[PDB]
Amino acid sequence: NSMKNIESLFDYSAGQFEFIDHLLTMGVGVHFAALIFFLVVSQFVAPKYRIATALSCIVMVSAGLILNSQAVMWTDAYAYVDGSYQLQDLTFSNGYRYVNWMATIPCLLLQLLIVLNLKGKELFSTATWLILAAWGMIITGYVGQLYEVDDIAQLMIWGAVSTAFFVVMNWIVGTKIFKNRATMLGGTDSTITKVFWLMMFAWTLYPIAYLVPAFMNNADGVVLRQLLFTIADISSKVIYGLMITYIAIQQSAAAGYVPAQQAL
Numbered sequence: 001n002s003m004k005n006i007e008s009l010f011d012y013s014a015g016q017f018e019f020i021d022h023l024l025t026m027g028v029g030v031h032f033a034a035l036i037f038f039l040v041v042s043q044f045v046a047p048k049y050r051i052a053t054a055l056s057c058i059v060m061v062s063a064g065l066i067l068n069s070q071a072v073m074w075t076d077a078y079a080y081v082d083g084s085y086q087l088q089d090l091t092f093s094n095g096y097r098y099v100n101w102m103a104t105i106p107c108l109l110l111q112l113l114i115v116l117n118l119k120g121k122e123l124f125s126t127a128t129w130l131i132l133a134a135w136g137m138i139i140t141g142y143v144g145q146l147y148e149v150d151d152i153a154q155l156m157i158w159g160a161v162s163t164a165f166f167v168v169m170n171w172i173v174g175t176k177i178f179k180n181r182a183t184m185l186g187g188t189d190s191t192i193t194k195v196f197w198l199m200m201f202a203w204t205l206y207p208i209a210y211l212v213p214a215f216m217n218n219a220d221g222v223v224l225r226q227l228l229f230t231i232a233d234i235s236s237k238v239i240y241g242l243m244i245t246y247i248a249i250q251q252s253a254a255a256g257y258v259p260a261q262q263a264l
């Protein structure tokens, strides 16, 4: 996969190489620090909603482990030779991000459905279709980025197919949010709507990073992509988790869970 991504085409100045490295290690540090927060506040969440915060812990460790792996692969694959960082070993590719999305995107989608108060049949059926759509999005996206060096037309076709799953997924999410916000407690019917708009904005940065090879095929585009991934990661995983957890606690408290009431 390393020969198929644009990162393998370029030499990097020390500044470019260090910035990328620092983005990845900063992301590791943010995810594992939020992990502790989610772990600690899980005691303030009613049993009904506690799985939602537990899923955030899983997202944090999953996302953090891959960012840590990328950071090490990044420094293993390049060496400072004659004033630049040059490819030494085929060990870095973005594909690990995609495979990980197969795991974390279901987790992120499940926490939302839980705080929406969906139960039994509807929860299982709704989650099945959302996870199938998300996997379809990720799988077609993954195949497309295998062509970002050798076939930009193929990257566009796979991306268009991926974007159809994305659109259908967002329609299911949005429909369930607007049809069920009336069941939300503690005033969180107003909060869940913002989470939906946060999702739209944060998730849409990923297709933009996907397209960098088409509009910025150079070492600065490599940096920009990692920057957009970092903003998208923090927003779609951390800030999103913080809001899901807020909703979990507020509804727990409204539902008469004392640890939630004593903590608010």
Ligand SMILES: CCCCCCCC/C=C\CCCCCCCC(=O)OC[C@H](O)CO
Pocket (backbone or CB within 6 Å): 160, 163, 164, 167, 168, 170, 171, 174, 175, 178, 179
């Ligand atoms: C490249 C090929 C793909 C072309 C794509 C063109 C179509 C884009 C339109 C919508 C995107 C999805 C937006 C999802 C917005 C959420 C929908 C929603 O909230 O539905 C409310 C429902 O009626 C409950 O009242």
Ligand SMILES: *C\C=C(C)/C=C/C=C(C)/C=C/C1=C(C)CCCC1(C)C
Pocket (backbone or CB within 6 Å): 101, 104, 105, 108, 137, 138, 141, 142, 159, 162, 163, 166, 203, 204, 206, 207, 210, 233, 236, 237
């Ligand atoms: C880390 C959490 C999430 C939800 C990551 C989400 C990723 C996407 C929504 C990616 C979408 C893509 C699309 C829509 C089309 C181009 C290829 C992508 C897979 C990057």
Ligand SMILES: CCCCCCCC/C=C\CCCCCCCC(=O)O
Pocket (backbone or CB within 6 Å): 047, 048, 049, 050, 051, 110, 123, 124, 127, 128, 131, 132
């Ligand atoms: C392989 C095809 C797709 C597989 C879809 C599987 C989706 C899993 C279904 C729903 C899991 C949600 C239930 C988790 C327990 C929460 C209930 C509780 O909080 O007590």
Ligand SMILES: [Cl-]
Pocket (backbone or CB within 6 Å): 062, 063, 066, 097, 100, 101, 104
């Ligand atoms: Cl992830």
Ligand SMILES: [Cl-]
Pocket (backbone or CB within 6 Å): 100, 101, 102, 103, 104, 105, 108
């Ligand atoms: Cl994800």
